[PDB]
């Protein structure tokens, strides 16, 4: 029985390929077709396709075409020496709010001022002078930000293999693979150190990383309980409407209607115990005979250490130091309320000049909202990092970090890849061609 080569056409062999997926949403409105009214899904069966959420070529497709639509809605610096002082007053301590000098011819809260001093003889009077935080940055443009559940769909000729195994870890094989032409609701909300309005899991809290035994790799933690948060600004600002230029607007809002209550947040301490208690129970598995110590973040730029929000159109920077702040020797221990349970707060600062889109560098201006601001979201994910230190005595310290901006989207695109169908394949058999 001599074998012979035979070519077949219609083989189900797959090949991972890249493409330019198109958006889809209900209602930000350019190039996005409406959602599919018939979201078909076919379970393949006994297939084991090796996934890899870290080497995925879809996260780059989402990181791009989102700075692109962001730039389409932003199509100016005027850095002059300011002059201000402390405001006339869980309480606000120092929040400078004043007006500047000459605009063309003859209120910047706290993280957008840089102190200076002239060379005159006014040093005996203590006359301070400020400057904008992005005075020497490339382009400072000026403009509602509401996340819409964008759906990425595959083009003609390509498919999407969505796994369904509830025990994901990031890489390795899957056992329940199904094909879909689109995806679930993806909220493009930007934030650091915490993932807001994400997607909960189906089993216990799972962690995932490219190499858990490495320190530079981001450790994405997906929860299974929508921990709520209540961040609000109890102040009241009024639109100044300063016009500078031939038909140009600017809004350096501010009013004294009791500027003493500092904007903060509220997190359920009872719910926060059950979350971290299950996380340490999972981290102890990969890290045996060790103490999972949580600690304060790093330093440098103020937009790194703090959490980034978006509440109705204003950005909040909150000190996340009261969060995690413990040692956690064994599983589910080391509590600290002594019978309190009094809503652990987070003091927050508010910026106006935003170093928009981490990686390139092109700031923008956020127009303030007239009145009180109140928002509420669900803390569903967590970004972490491990400090590789030689003083490791069974205490591997973890920090919130924040990592790259792409890590906020790898926690939602970890379930699928884009494949191409190669239809021809060869195989040997016993037939022979007549000649």
């Amino acid at each position, epitope marked *: 029985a001599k074998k012979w080569v035979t070519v077949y056409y219609g083989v189900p062999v797959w090949k991972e390929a890249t493409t330019t997926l198109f958006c889809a949403s209900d209602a930000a409105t350019h190039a996005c077709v409406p959602t599919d009214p018939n979201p078909q899904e076919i379970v393949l069966g006994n297939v084991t396709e090796n996934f890899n959420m870290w080497k995925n070529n879809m996260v780059e497709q989402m990181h791009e075409d989102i700075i692109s639509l962001w730039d389409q809605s932003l199509k100016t610096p005027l850095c002059v020496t300011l002059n201000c002082n402390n405001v006339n007053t869980m309480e606000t301590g120092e929040m400078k709010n004043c007006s500047f000098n000459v605009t063309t011819s003859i209120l910047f809260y706290k*993280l957008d*001022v*840089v*102190p200076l001093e002239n060379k005159n003889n006014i040093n005996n009077t203590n006359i301070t002078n400020y400057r904008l*935080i*992005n005075c*020497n*940055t490339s382009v400072i443009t000026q403009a509602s930000f509401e996340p819409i559940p964008i759906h990425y769909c595959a083009p003609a000729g390509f498919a999407i293999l969505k796994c369904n195994s509830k025990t994901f870890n990031g890489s390795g094989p899957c056992t329940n693979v199904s094909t879909v032409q689109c995806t679930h609701g993806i909220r493009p909300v930007v934030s650091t150190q915490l993932l807001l309005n994400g997607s909960l899991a189906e089993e216990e809290i799972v962690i995932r990383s490219e190499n858990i035994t490495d320190n*530079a790799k981001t450790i994405i933690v997906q929860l299974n309980e929508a921990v709520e948060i209540n961040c609000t600004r109890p102040n009241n600002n009024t639109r100044k409407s300063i016009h500078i230029g031939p038909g140009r607007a600017f809004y350096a809002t501010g009013d004294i209607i009791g500027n003493i209550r500092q904007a903060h947040c509220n997190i359920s301490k009872a719910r926060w115990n059950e979350t971290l208690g299950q996380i340490v129970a999972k981290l102890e598995e990969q890290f045996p005979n060790k103490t999972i110590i949580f600690n304060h973040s*790093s*330093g*440098g*730029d*103020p*937009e*790194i*250490v703090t959490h980034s929000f978006n509440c109705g159109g204003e950005f909040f920077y909150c*000190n996340t*130091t009261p969060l995690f702040n413990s040692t956690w020797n064994n599983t589910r221990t080391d509590d600290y309320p002594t019978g309190g349970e009094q809503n652990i707060t987070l*003091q927050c600062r508010i910026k106006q000049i935003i*170093n928009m*889109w*981490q*990686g*390139v*560098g092109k700031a923008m201006y956020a127009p303030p909202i007239r009145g009180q601001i109140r928002c509420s979201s669900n803390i569903t994910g967590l970004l972490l*990092t491990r400090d590789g230190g*030689r003083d490791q005595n069974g205490t591997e310290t973890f920090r919130p*970090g*924040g*990592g*790259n901006m792409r890590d906020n989207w790898r926690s939602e695109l970890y379930k699928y890849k884009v494949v191409k169908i190669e239809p021809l394949g060869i195989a040997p058999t016993a037939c022979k061609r007549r000649v």
Partner: nanobody
Framework: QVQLVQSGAEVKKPGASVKVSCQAS????????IHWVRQAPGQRFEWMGW????????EFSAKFQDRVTFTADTSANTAYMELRSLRSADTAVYYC????????????????????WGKGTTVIVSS
């Protein structure tokens, strides 16, 4: 521990492009700002600018406006410094520094005092 290791010496002809590199080891390079200063034998130190590898924010001094460019690699934990033009007066020892941590009770620029330096590389224009 925190340590910055620079590259070796690089003797180049006047009009070339010297590429001085930095390397972060004991911390997360994507969270701190890196400074570059210059030191000539007998002269004083002189600031050359800084780069923010987190958001890509770059700021260089007016003296080196169109002569020195800054580039950084986040995934490799290395900061680079390119030079457009050269001159025999640029024969100096280049450094590399790292800013300090940010505290909750200070201005956004009170923590850029160059905590950790680096083993300074030297460049010669004409030997």
């Amino acid at each position: 521990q925190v340590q910055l290791v620079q590259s070796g010496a690089e003797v180049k002809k006047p009009g070339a492009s010297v590429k001085v590199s930095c390397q972060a080891s004991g911390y997360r390079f994507s969270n701190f700002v890196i400074h570059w200063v210059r030191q000539a034998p007998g002269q004083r130190f002189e600031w050359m600018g800084w780069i923010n590898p987190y958001n890509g924010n770059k700021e260089f001094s007016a003296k080196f406006q169109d002569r020195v460019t800054f580039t950084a690699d986040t995934s490799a934990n290395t900061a680079y410094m390119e030079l457009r033009s050269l001159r025999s007066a640029d024969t100096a020892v280049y450094y590399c520094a790292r800013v300090g941590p940010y505290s909750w009770d200070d201005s956004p620029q009170d923590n850029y005092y160059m905590d950790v330096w680096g083993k300074g590389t030297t460049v010669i224009v004409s030997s």
